[PDB]
Every structure is written in structure tokens, then in C-alpha cells.
Design a protein around this ligand. Sequence first.
Ligand code: IRI
Ligand code: IRI
Ligand code: IRI
Ligand SMILES: [K+]
Length: 14
Amino acid sequence: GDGRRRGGGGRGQG
RNA sequence: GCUGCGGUGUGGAAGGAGUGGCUGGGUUGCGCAGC
Ligand code: IRI
Ligand code: IRI
Ligand code: IRI
Ligand SMILES: [K+]
């Protein structure tokens, strides 16, 4: 899971 | 690789899903969960 580790709205970027 | 829950806070009890996010923690951190 090399991608978004946290979702829902705008959580999890960088 | 994608997605969901203001669920977390060195403010988190007057808030939210960033319609404050070049105003910070934080290039949306942390936790939990699902495909
Ligand atoms: N969960 Ir309380 N954050 N710890 N609301 N009880 N203060
Ligand atoms: N400038 Ir800033 N926005 N505060 N360090 N990049 N995070
Ligand atoms: N501007 Ir900012 N919000 N502080 N993107 N660098 N993290
Ligand atoms: K805040």
C-alpha cells in the first residue's frame, strides 16, 4: 500500500 | 493503488472533512476502519 494511508475528505497527502 | 469516520491535538469544549489550510501544528500531521 504505497499510496494514501488515510482517506476521507482531505486527509492524507504530502 | 484507492476510499470511509471532527474519530486525534502543545487550544480540540463553544468548530469543520479543509468553503481558514502559503495563519500554525501539517505540503492534510496522528489514530481507526474498509476495498
Ligand atoms: N474524548 Ir475528550 N477529547 N478526551 N471530548 N472526553 N475531552
Ligand atoms: N511556510 Ir509552511 N506553509 N508554514 N513551513 N511550508 N508549512
Ligand atoms: N501551506 Ir501547508 N497547509 N502549512 N500546505 N505547507 N502544510
Ligand atoms: K485547527
